[PDB]
Amino acid sequence: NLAPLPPHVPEHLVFDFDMYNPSNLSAGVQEAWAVLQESNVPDLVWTRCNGGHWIATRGQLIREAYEDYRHFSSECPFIPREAGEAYDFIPTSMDPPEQRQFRALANQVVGMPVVDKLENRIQELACSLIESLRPQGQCNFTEDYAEPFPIRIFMLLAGLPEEDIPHLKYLTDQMTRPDGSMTFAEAKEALYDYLIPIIEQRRQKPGTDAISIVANGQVNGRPITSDEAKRMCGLLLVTGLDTVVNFLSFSMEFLAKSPEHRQELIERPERIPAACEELLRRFSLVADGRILTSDYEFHGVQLKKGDQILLPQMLSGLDERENACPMHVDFSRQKVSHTTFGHGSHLCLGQHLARREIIVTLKEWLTRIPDFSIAPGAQIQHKSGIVSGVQALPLVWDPATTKAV
Ligand code: HEM
Ligand SMILES: CC1(C)[C@@H]2CC[C@@]1(C)C(=O)C2
Ligand SMILES: [K+]
Protein backbone atom coordinates (compact mmCIF):
# COMPACT_ATOMS: atom_id res chain seq x y z
CA ASN A 1 0.00 0.00 0.00
CA LEU A 2 1.06 3.63 0.37
CA ALA A 3 2.95 4.74 3.48
CA PRO A 4 1.71 7.92 5.20
CA LEU A 5 3.17 11.13 3.76
CA PRO A 6 5.96 12.52 5.97
CA PRO A 7 5.11 16.04 7.19
CA HIS A 8 8.12 17.62 5.46
CA VAL A 9 7.05 16.38 2.03
CA PRO A 10 4.77 18.74 0.07
CA GLU A 11 1.72 17.16 -1.56
CA HIS A 12 2.53 18.51 -5.03
CA LEU A 13 5.70 16.41 -5.23
CA VAL A 14 3.96 13.09 -4.58
CA PHE A 15 4.13 10.59 -7.45
CA ASP A 16 3.40 7.02 -6.33
CA PHE A 17 5.85 5.11 -8.54
CA ASP A 18 6.45 1.44 -7.59
CA MET A 19 9.97 0.40 -8.62
CA TYR A 20 9.13 -3.29 -8.13
CA ASN A 21 5.93 -3.19 -10.19
CA PRO A 22 5.62 0.01 -12.27
CA SER A 23 2.12 0.69 -13.65
CA ASN A 24 3.26 1.05 -17.28
CA LEU A 25 5.30 -2.18 -17.25
CA SER A 26 3.35 -3.62 -20.21
CA ALA A 27 4.95 -1.10 -22.58
CA GLY A 28 8.43 -2.25 -21.56
CA VAL A 29 10.32 -1.68 -18.31
CA GLN A 30 12.42 1.23 -19.60
CA GLU A 31 9.22 2.81 -20.93
CA ALA A 32 7.59 2.16 -17.55
CA TRP A 33 10.30 4.13 -15.74
CA ALA A 34 10.31 6.82 -18.43
CA VAL A 35 6.88 7.88 -17.22
CA LEU A 36 8.86 9.72 -14.54
CA GLN A 37 10.13 11.98 -17.34
CA GLU A 38 6.76 13.18 -18.66
CA SER A 39 6.08 16.92 -19.01
CA ASN A 40 3.93 16.93 -15.87
CA VAL A 41 6.50 15.35 -13.55
CA PRO A 42 8.97 17.39 -11.42
CA ASP A 43 12.71 16.67 -11.39
CA LEU A 44 12.48 15.28 -7.85
CA VAL A 45 9.39 13.46 -6.57
CA TRP A 46 8.27 11.47 -3.53
CA THR A 47 6.63 8.05 -3.81
CA ARG A 48 4.62 6.50 -0.98
CA CYS A 49 5.35 3.04 -2.35
CA ASN A 50 7.80 0.61 -0.77
CA GLY A 51 7.88 2.49 2.51
CA GLY A 52 8.24 5.93 0.99
CA HIS A 53 11.24 7.55 -0.68
CA TRP A 54 12.49 10.26 -3.01
CA ILE A 55 13.24 9.69 -6.69
CA ALA A 56 15.50 11.82 -8.87
CA THR A 57 14.07 11.68 -12.41
CA ARG A 58 16.75 13.52 -14.42
CA GLY A 59 20.36 12.80 -15.33
CA GLN A 60 21.52 16.14 -13.94
CA LEU A 61 20.24 15.42 -10.41
CA ILE A 62 21.25 11.75 -10.54
CA ARG A 63 24.83 12.64 -11.46
CA GLU A 64 25.02 15.41 -8.86
CA ALA A 65 23.77 13.14 -6.07
CA TYR A 66 26.16 10.31 -6.94
CA GLU A 67 29.00 12.83 -6.87
CA ASP A 68 28.08 14.23 -3.43
CA TYR A 69 28.72 11.32 -1.06
CA ARG A 70 28.88 13.72 1.91
CA HIS A 71 25.13 14.31 1.67
CA PHE A 72 24.08 11.12 -0.12
CA SER A 73 25.56 8.09 1.64
CA SER A 74 25.85 4.53 0.30
CA GLU A 75 25.43 3.05 3.80
CA CYS A 76 21.77 2.30 2.97
CA PRO A 77 21.71 1.95 -0.87
CA PHE A 78 18.61 -0.19 -1.36
CA ILE A 79 14.85 0.39 -1.09
CA PRO A 80 12.93 -1.01 1.05
CA ARG A 81 14.66 0.52 4.02
CA GLU A 82 15.06 -2.95 5.61
CA ALA A 83 16.89 -4.15 2.53
CA GLY A 84 19.10 -1.06 2.55
CA GLU A 85 19.88 -1.50 6.24
CA ALA A 86 20.76 -5.18 5.76
CA TYR A 87 22.84 -4.44 2.66
CA ASP A 88 26.50 -4.63 3.65
CA PHE A 89 28.44 -5.74 0.58
CA ILE A 90 31.88 -4.23 0.07
CA PRO A 91 32.74 -1.76 -1.32
CA THR A 92 29.20 -0.66 -2.26
CA SER A 93 27.91 -0.18 1.30
CA MET A 94 30.81 2.17 2.14
CA ASP A 95 31.51 5.85 1.46
CA PRO A 96 34.91 7.37 0.74
CA PRO A 97 37.44 7.55 2.25
CA GLU A 98 37.03 4.04 3.69
CA GLN A 99 35.58 2.63 0.45
CA ARG A 100 38.58 3.30 -1.81
CA GLN A 101 40.98 0.72 -0.34
CA PHE A 102 38.65 -2.13 -1.28
CA ARG A 103 38.23 -1.08 -4.92
CA ALA A 104 41.88 -1.92 -5.63
CA LEU A 105 41.47 -5.48 -4.37
CA ALA A 106 38.16 -5.97 -6.18
CA ASN A 107 39.80 -4.78 -9.38
CA GLN A 108 42.23 -7.71 -9.15
CA VAL A 109 39.41 -10.21 -9.67
CA VAL A 110 36.92 -8.38 -11.90
CA GLY A 111 39.02 -5.67 -13.51
CA MET A 112 40.76 -5.55 -16.87
CA PRO A 113 43.55 -7.95 -15.83
CA VAL A 114 40.91 -10.61 -15.19
CA VAL A 115 39.37 -10.03 -18.63
CA ASP A 116 42.63 -10.98 -20.33
CA LYS A 117 43.06 -14.06 -18.13
CA LEU A 118 39.70 -15.35 -19.37
CA GLU A 119 39.58 -13.76 -22.83
CA ASN A 120 40.00 -17.13 -24.56
CA ARG A 121 37.50 -19.05 -22.42
CA ILE A 122 34.91 -16.31 -22.94
CA GLN A 123 35.32 -16.56 -26.71
CA GLU A 124 35.16 -20.36 -26.70
CA LEU A 125 32.07 -20.56 -24.50
CA ALA A 126 30.06 -18.07 -26.55
CA CYS A 127 30.85 -19.94 -29.76
CA SER A 128 30.14 -23.40 -28.36
CA LEU A 129 26.87 -22.29 -26.78
CA ILE A 130 25.70 -20.59 -29.99
CA GLU A 131 26.72 -23.40 -32.34
CA SER A 132 24.82 -25.92 -30.22
CA LEU A 133 21.67 -23.83 -30.67
CA ARG A 134 22.14 -22.83 -34.33
CA PRO A 135 20.70 -25.98 -35.97
CA GLN A 136 17.61 -25.94 -33.74
CA GLY A 137 16.09 -22.86 -35.38
CA GLN A 138 14.70 -21.85 -31.99
CA CYS A 139 15.66 -21.20 -28.37
CA ASN A 140 14.50 -19.77 -25.07
CA PHE A 141 17.22 -17.12 -24.99
CA THR A 142 17.02 -16.26 -21.29
CA GLU A 143 17.79 -19.79 -20.12
CA ASP A 144 19.73 -21.06 -23.15
CA TYR A 145 22.32 -18.29 -23.38
CA ALA A 146 21.70 -15.12 -21.34
CA GLU A 147 22.00 -17.07 -18.09
CA PRO A 148 24.61 -19.77 -18.89
CA PHE A 149 27.12 -17.53 -20.69
CA PRO A 150 27.85 -14.87 -18.03
CA ILE A 151 27.13 -17.23 -15.12
CA ARG A 152 29.42 -20.06 -16.26
CA ILE A 153 32.21 -17.54 -16.85
CA PHE A 154 31.80 -16.25 -13.31
CA MET A 155 31.60 -19.69 -11.70
CA LEU A 156 34.77 -20.68 -13.57
CA LEU A 157 36.49 -17.49 -12.40
CA ALA A 158 35.35 -18.03 -8.81
CA GLY A 159 36.05 -21.77 -8.86
CA LEU A 160 32.52 -22.76 -7.84
CA PRO A 161 30.64 -25.85 -9.13
CA GLU A 162 28.13 -25.28 -11.93
CA GLU A 163 25.54 -27.41 -10.12
CA ASP A 164 25.29 -24.65 -7.48
CA ILE A 165 23.94 -22.12 -10.00
CA PRO A 166 20.22 -22.82 -9.48
CA HIS A 167 20.48 -22.11 -5.75
CA LEU A 168 22.78 -19.10 -6.02
CA LYS A 169 20.74 -17.58 -8.84
CA TYR A 170 17.57 -17.87 -6.75
CA LEU A 171 19.09 -16.13 -3.72
CA THR A 172 20.58 -13.38 -5.87
CA ASP A 173 17.27 -12.64 -7.57
CA GLN A 174 15.64 -12.24 -4.16
CA MET A 175 17.91 -9.27 -3.45
CA THR A 176 17.08 -7.52 -6.73
CA ARG A 177 13.57 -8.68 -7.72
CA PRO A 178 12.13 -10.53 -4.67
CA ASP A 179 9.16 -12.84 -5.20
CA GLY A 180 8.05 -12.30 -1.62
CA SER A 181 9.22 -15.62 -0.19
CA MET A 182 12.42 -14.11 1.22
CA THR A 183 13.38 -10.79 2.76
CA PHE A 184 16.66 -9.26 1.61
CA ALA A 185 18.12 -10.05 5.03
CA GLU A 186 17.19 -13.72 4.65
CA ALA A 187 18.66 -13.97 1.15
CA LYS A 188 21.85 -12.28 2.36
CA GLU A 189 22.08 -14.68 5.30
CA ALA A 190 21.76 -17.66 2.97
CA LEU A 191 24.37 -16.30 0.58
CA TYR A 192 26.80 -15.92 3.48
CA ASP A 193 25.83 -19.35 4.78
CA TYR A 194 27.20 -20.64 1.45
CA LEU A 195 30.32 -18.42 1.32
CA ILE A 196 31.67 -18.49 4.90
CA PRO A 197 32.95 -22.10 4.77
CA ILE A 198 34.42 -21.67 1.28
CA ILE A 199 36.29 -18.55 2.40
CA GLU A 200 37.75 -20.35 5.41
CA GLN A 201 38.83 -23.30 3.27
CA ARG A 202 40.51 -21.04 0.70
CA ARG A 203 42.28 -19.07 3.42
CA GLN A 204 43.85 -22.23 4.84
CA LYS A 205 44.49 -23.68 1.39
CA PRO A 206 44.67 -20.76 -1.10
CA GLY A 207 43.98 -21.30 -4.79
CA THR A 208 44.16 -19.22 -8.00
CA ASP A 209 40.39 -18.54 -8.12
CA ALA A 210 38.68 -15.20 -7.45
CA ILE A 211 37.52 -16.20 -3.97
CA SER A 212 41.02 -17.28 -2.92
CA ILE A 213 42.47 -13.98 -4.18
CA VAL A 214 40.01 -11.82 -2.25
CA ALA A 215 40.14 -14.02 0.85
CA ASN A 216 43.93 -13.83 1.02
CA GLY A 217 44.12 -10.27 -0.24
CA GLN A 218 45.49 -7.10 1.26
CA VAL A 219 43.76 -3.73 1.60
CA ASN A 220 46.11 -0.75 1.68
CA GLY A 221 48.95 -2.89 3.00
CA ARG A 222 47.11 -4.87 5.67
CA PRO A 223 45.42 -8.31 5.68
CA ILE A 224 41.76 -8.37 4.71
CA THR A 225 39.56 -9.90 7.41
CA SER A 226 37.34 -12.96 6.93
CA ASP A 227 34.29 -10.75 7.41
CA GLU A 228 35.45 -8.17 4.84
CA ALA A 229 36.29 -10.95 2.39
CA LYS A 230 32.82 -12.41 2.88
CA ARG A 231 31.12 -9.07 2.18
CA MET A 232 33.18 -8.54 -0.98
CA CYS A 233 32.62 -12.05 -2.30
CA GLY A 234 28.89 -11.60 -1.83
CA LEU A 235 28.92 -8.67 -4.22
CA LEU A 236 30.89 -10.71 -6.76
CA LEU A 237 28.23 -13.42 -6.80
CA VAL A 238 25.45 -10.89 -7.31
CA THR A 239 27.26 -9.06 -10.11
CA GLY A 240 28.19 -12.37 -11.67
CA LEU A 241 24.67 -13.77 -11.62
CA ASP A 242 22.32 -10.83 -12.16
CA THR A 243 23.81 -8.11 -14.35
CA VAL A 244 25.00 -9.05 -17.83
CA VAL A 245 22.49 -11.91 -17.69
CA ASN A 246 19.62 -9.43 -17.88
CA PHE A 247 21.16 -6.94 -20.26
CA LEU A 248 21.85 -9.56 -22.92
CA SER A 249 18.15 -10.41 -23.15
CA PHE A 250 17.08 -6.78 -23.57
CA SER A 251 19.63 -6.42 -26.36
CA MET A 252 18.69 -9.60 -28.21
CA GLU A 253 14.98 -8.81 -27.83
CA PHE A 254 15.60 -5.52 -29.61
CA LEU A 255 17.77 -7.08 -32.32
CA ALA A 256 15.14 -9.76 -32.97
CA LYS A 257 12.60 -6.99 -33.50
CA SER A 258 14.84 -4.80 -35.65
CA PRO A 259 16.01 -6.34 -38.96
CA GLU A 260 17.52 -3.01 -40.04
CA HIS A 261 19.77 -2.84 -36.97
CA ARG A 262 20.87 -6.44 -37.36
CA GLN A 263 21.69 -5.67 -40.98
CA GLU A 264 23.76 -2.65 -39.96
CA LEU A 265 26.02 -4.73 -37.72
CA ILE A 266 26.29 -7.54 -40.27
CA GLU A 267 27.50 -5.21 -43.02
CA ARG A 268 29.53 -3.04 -40.63
CA PRO A 269 30.76 -5.26 -37.74
CA GLU A 270 33.26 -2.59 -36.67
CA ARG A 271 30.25 -0.69 -35.34
CA ILE A 272 29.50 -3.41 -32.77
CA PRO A 273 31.45 -1.74 -29.95
CA ALA A 274 29.54 1.50 -30.57
CA ALA A 275 26.24 -0.38 -30.85
CA CYS A 276 27.00 -2.02 -27.49
CA GLU A 277 27.32 1.41 -25.93
CA GLU A 278 24.09 2.68 -27.50
CA LEU A 279 22.29 -0.45 -26.28
CA LEU A 280 23.68 0.03 -22.77
CA ARG A 281 22.06 3.48 -22.88
CA ARG A 282 18.70 2.51 -24.38
CA PHE A 283 18.31 -0.62 -22.28
CA SER A 284 19.93 0.58 -19.06
CA LEU A 285 18.60 -1.58 -16.20
CA VAL A 286 19.90 -0.63 -12.74
CA ALA A 287 18.35 1.54 -10.05
CA ASP A 288 19.67 1.82 -6.50
CA GLY A 289 20.34 4.89 -4.37
CA ARG A 290 21.52 6.64 -1.20
CA ILE A 291 20.44 7.91 2.22
CA LEU A 292 20.56 11.53 3.45
CA THR A 293 23.20 12.13 6.12
CA SER A 294 21.59 15.42 7.20
CA ASP A 295 18.86 17.92 6.30
CA TYR A 296 19.73 19.24 2.84
CA GLU A 297 18.01 21.55 0.35
CA PHE A 298 18.47 19.96 -3.06
CA HIS A 299 17.19 21.78 -6.15
CA GLY A 300 14.56 23.63 -4.14
CA VAL A 301 13.43 20.49 -2.34
CA GLN A 302 13.90 19.97 1.40
CA LEU A 303 15.37 16.53 2.07
CA LYS A 304 15.45 15.33 5.68
CA LYS A 305 18.25 13.40 7.39
CA GLY A 306 17.56 9.69 7.01
CA ASP A 307 15.36 10.09 3.93
CA GLN A 308 16.03 7.51 1.22
CA ILE A 309 16.51 8.67 -2.36
CA LEU A 310 16.43 6.41 -5.41
CA LEU A 311 18.86 7.61 -8.11
CA PRO A 312 17.97 5.42 -11.14
CA GLN A 313 21.17 4.86 -13.11
CA MET A 314 18.72 3.78 -15.83
CA LEU A 315 17.10 7.21 -16.25
CA SER A 316 20.14 9.42 -17.00
CA GLY A 317 20.56 8.10 -20.54
CA LEU A 318 16.82 7.94 -21.26
CA ASP A 319 16.54 11.62 -20.29
CA GLU A 320 15.86 13.73 -23.39
CA ARG A 321 17.88 16.50 -21.76
CA GLU A 322 20.90 14.21 -22.15
CA ASN A 323 20.07 12.53 -25.48
CA ALA A 324 17.70 13.69 -28.23
CA CYS A 325 15.01 11.15 -29.18
CA PRO A 326 16.13 8.96 -26.21
CA MET A 327 13.89 5.99 -26.99
CA HIS A 328 15.37 5.66 -30.49
CA VAL A 329 18.36 3.35 -31.00
CA ASP A 330 21.01 5.02 -33.18
CA PHE A 331 24.34 3.18 -33.45
CA SER A 332 25.75 6.36 -35.01
CA ARG A 333 24.51 8.57 -32.17
CA GLN A 334 27.22 11.20 -31.61
CA LYS A 335 27.57 11.54 -27.83
CA VAL A 336 26.09 8.52 -26.07
CA SER A 337 25.39 9.97 -22.63
CA HIS A 338 24.46 7.59 -19.80
CA THR A 339 25.18 6.37 -16.26
CA THR A 340 24.38 2.72 -16.92
CA PHE A 341 27.48 1.59 -15.02
CA GLY A 342 26.92 4.08 -12.21
CA HIS A 343 28.49 7.47 -11.45
CA GLY A 344 30.76 8.81 -8.72
CA SER A 345 33.26 6.88 -6.60
CA HIS A 346 31.25 3.66 -6.98
CA LEU A 347 31.54 3.48 -10.77
CA CYS A 348 31.27 -0.13 -11.94
CA LEU A 349 34.57 -2.02 -11.71
CA GLY A 350 33.42 -4.91 -13.87
CA GLN A 351 32.43 -2.81 -16.86
CA HIS A 352 35.34 -4.13 -18.94
CA LEU A 353 34.20 -7.71 -18.42
CA ALA A 354 30.59 -6.73 -19.10
CA ARG A 355 31.41 -5.00 -22.38
CA ARG A 356 33.52 -7.94 -23.52
CA GLU A 357 30.72 -10.42 -22.82
CA ILE A 358 28.24 -8.19 -24.64
CA ILE A 359 30.45 -7.49 -27.67
CA VAL A 360 31.53 -11.12 -28.00
CA THR A 361 27.89 -12.23 -27.82
CA LEU A 362 26.74 -9.84 -30.55
CA LYS A 363 29.65 -10.67 -32.85
CA GLU A 364 29.51 -14.45 -32.55
CA TRP A 365 25.71 -14.57 -32.64
CA LEU A 366 25.23 -12.45 -35.76
CA THR A 367 28.07 -14.41 -37.37
CA ARG A 368 26.20 -17.71 -37.02
CA ILE A 369 22.57 -16.56 -36.76
CA PRO A 370 22.31 -13.26 -38.68
CA ASP A 371 18.57 -13.53 -39.27
CA PHE A 372 16.26 -14.31 -36.34
CA SER A 373 13.07 -12.99 -34.76
CA ILE A 374 10.67 -13.22 -31.83
CA ALA A 375 8.59 -16.39 -31.90
CA PRO A 376 5.25 -15.83 -33.71
CA GLY A 377 2.54 -14.48 -31.42
CA ALA A 378 4.94 -14.24 -28.48
CA GLN A 379 4.40 -11.35 -26.05
CA ILE A 380 7.59 -10.34 -24.26
CA GLN A 381 7.20 -9.54 -20.56
CA HIS A 382 9.66 -7.56 -18.46
CA LYS A 383 10.24 -7.36 -14.70
CA SER A 384 11.36 -4.38 -12.58
CA GLY A 385 13.49 -4.00 -9.44
CA ILE A 386 16.99 -2.95 -8.33
CA VAL A 387 17.98 -4.63 -11.59
CA SER A 388 15.33 -5.14 -14.27
CA GLY A 389 14.99 -8.03 -16.70
CA VAL A 390 13.11 -10.14 -19.21
CA GLN A 391 10.87 -13.02 -18.10
CA ALA A 392 11.41 -15.08 -21.25
CA LEU A 393 12.58 -14.53 -24.80
CA PRO A 394 11.53 -17.14 -27.38
CA LEU A 395 13.45 -16.76 -30.62
CA VAL A 396 13.11 -18.53 -33.98
CA TRP A 397 15.07 -18.64 -37.22
CA ASP A 398 15.53 -20.59 -40.44
CA PRO A 399 18.52 -22.94 -39.96
CA ALA A 400 19.13 -22.56 -43.71
CA THR A 401 20.09 -18.90 -43.23
CA THR A 402 22.66 -19.75 -40.56
CA LYS A 403 26.38 -20.36 -40.95
CA ALA A 404 28.56 -22.85 -39.10
CA VAL A 405 32.07 -21.68 -38.22
C1 HEM B 1 25.89 -4.63 -17.74
C2 HEM B 1 26.32 -5.11 -16.51
C3 HEM B 1 26.54 -4.35 -15.35
C4 HEM B 1 25.92 -3.19 -14.95
C5 HEM B 1 24.82 -2.43 -15.70
C6 HEM B 1 26.55 -2.78 -13.72
C7 HEM B 1 26.23 -1.62 -13.02
C8 HEM B 1 26.84 -1.17 -11.85
C9 HEM B 1 26.41 -0.01 -11.09
C10 HEM B 1 25.19 0.84 -11.40
C11 HEM B 1 27.23 0.08 -10.03
C12 HEM B 1 27.22 1.09 -8.89
C13 HEM B 1 26.06 0.96 -7.92
C14 HEM B 1 26.08 2.02 -6.84
O15 HEM B 1 26.66 3.10 -7.07
O16 HEM B 1 25.50 1.80 -5.76
C17 HEM B 1 28.14 -1.06 -10.10
C18 HEM B 1 29.09 -1.39 -9.13
C19 HEM B 1 29.92 -2.51 -9.15
N20 HEM B 1 29.96 -3.45 -10.15
FE21 HEM B 1 28.90 -3.45 -11.91
N22 HEM B 1 27.57 -3.66 -13.36
C23 HEM B 1 27.55 -4.64 -14.32
C24 HEM B 1 28.35 -5.76 -14.31
C25 HEM B 1 29.31 -6.08 -13.36
C26 HEM B 1 30.15 -7.25 -13.41
C27 HEM B 1 30.07 -8.34 -14.48
C28 HEM B 1 30.99 -7.20 -12.33
C29 HEM B 1 31.97 -8.12 -11.96
C30 HEM B 1 32.79 -8.79 -12.85
C31 HEM B 1 30.64 -5.98 -11.62
C32 HEM B 1 31.23 -5.53 -10.44
C33 HEM B 1 30.93 -4.37 -9.76
C34 HEM B 1 31.53 -3.96 -8.50
C35 HEM B 1 32.68 -4.65 -7.77
C36 HEM B 1 30.88 -2.84 -8.13
C37 HEM B 1 31.03 -2.06 -6.85
C38 HEM B 1 32.07 -0.95 -6.93
C39 HEM B 1 32.05 -0.07 -5.70
O40 HEM B 1 31.04 -0.09 -4.97
O41 HEM B 1 33.03 0.66 -5.47
N42 HEM B 1 29.64 -5.29 -12.30
N43 HEM B 1 27.90 -1.80 -11.22
C1 LIG C 1 23.23 -2.03 -7.90
C2 LIG C 1 24.14 -3.07 -8.54
C3 LIG C 1 23.87 -3.33 -10.02
C4 LIG C 1 25.62 -2.82 -8.25
C5 LIG C 1 26.39 -4.12 -8.56
C6 LIG C 1 25.35 -5.26 -8.32
C7 LIG C 1 24.25 -4.39 -7.69
C8 LIG C 1 22.92 -5.14 -7.64
C9 LIG C 1 24.72 -4.01 -6.27
O10 LIG C 1 24.43 -4.43 -5.15
C11 LIG C 1 25.78 -3.06 -6.76
K1 LIG D 1 23.46 -1.10 5.43
Is residue 242 annotated as part of the catalytic site, yes or no?
A: yes
Alpha helices in 322-370 (DSSP H): 351-368
Contacts of 71 (CB under 8 A, 6+ apart): 65, 292, 293, 294, 296, 298
Contact 51, 4 (CB under 8 A): no
Return the best residue to mutate from 74, 156, 157, 243 for the ligand 1 pocket (most ligand atoms within 8 A of CB).
Answer: 243
Q: Are strands 53-56 and 138-140 parallel, antiparallel or unpaired?
A: unpaired
Burial string for 54-90 (b: 16+ CB within 10 Å, else e) reads: bbbbbbebbbbbbeebebbbbebbbbbbebbebbbbb
The catalytically annotated residue of 177, 281, 282, 356 is: 177
Q: Sign of the C-alpha dihedral, residues 142, 143, 147, 149?
A: negative
Burial of 208 (0-12, 13-18, 19+ CB in 10 A): exposed
Is residue 177 annotated as part of the catalytic site, yes or no?
A: yes
Is residue 348 annotated as part of the catalytic site, yes or no?
A: yes
The catalytically annotated residue of 84, 350, 385, 389 is: 350
Q: Looking at this protein, which amino acid is placed at residue 62?
A: I
Return the best residue to mutate from 235, 245, 311, 351 for the ligand 2 pocket (most ligand atoms within 8 A of CB).
Answer: 235
Task: Evaluate: CB of 147 within 6 angstroms of ligand 1.
Answer: no
Classify domain 1-405 by CATH architecture.
Orthogonal Bundle (1.10)
What residue spans define the domains of the chain?
1-405
Q: Are strands 53-56 and 44-47 parallel, antiparallel or unpaired?
A: antiparallel
Nearest to 55 by CA among 70, 31, 34: 34
User: d(Cα 268, Cα 317) in Å, to the nearest integer?
Assistant: 25
The catalytically annotated residue of 160, 255, 292, 348 is: 348
Least distant ligand from the CA of 85: 3
Is residue 179 annotated as part of the catalytic site, yes or no?
A: no
3-state secondary structure at position 55: strand
Residues facing residue 44 across a β-bridge: 56
End-to-end Cα separation, the chain, in angstroms: 54
Distance of CA 377 from the midpoint of ligand 1 (Å)? 35
Contacts of 317 (CB under 8 A, 6+ apart): 59, 280, 281, 282, 284, 323, 326, 336, 337, 338, 339, 340
Distance of CA 87 from the midpoint of ligand 3 (Å)? 4
Whole-angstrom CA distances from 130 to 9, 180, 399, 405 are 52, 34, 13, 10
Burial of 193 (0-12, 13-18, 19+ CB in 10 A): exposed
Element (H, E) at 64: helix 59-67
Q: CB 292: neighbour CB atoms within 10 A? A: 20
User: Does 139 appear as a known binding residue?
Assistant: no
Contacts of 267 (CB under 8 A, 6+ apart): none
Residues facing residue 55 across a β-bridge: 45, 310
3-state secondary structure at position 336: coil
Burial of 296 (0-12, 13-18, 19+ CB in 10 A): middle
Element (H, E) at 47: strand 44-47
Nearest to 76 by CA among 305, 312, 306, 339: 306
The catalytically annotated residue of 195, 349, 362, 393 is: 349
User: d(Cα 140, Cα 311) in Å, to the nearest integer?
Assistant: 32
To one decimal, the resolution in angstroms is 1.8
Contact 124, 153 (CB under 8 A): no
User: d(Cα 180, Cα 229) in Å, to the nearest integer?
Assistant: 29
User: d(Cα 279, Cα 250) in Å, to the nearest integer?
Assistant: 9
Task: Evaluate: CB of 239 within 6 angstroms of ligand 1.
Answer: yes
User: d(Cα 81, Cα 75) in Å, to the nearest integer?
Assistant: 11
Distance of CA 76 from the midpoint of ligand 1 (Å)? 16
Way the structure was solved: X-ray
3-state secondary structure at position 284: coil
Q: CB 123: neighbour CB atoms within 10 A? A: 14
User: d(Cα 222, Cα 195) in Å, to the nearest integer?
Assistant: 22
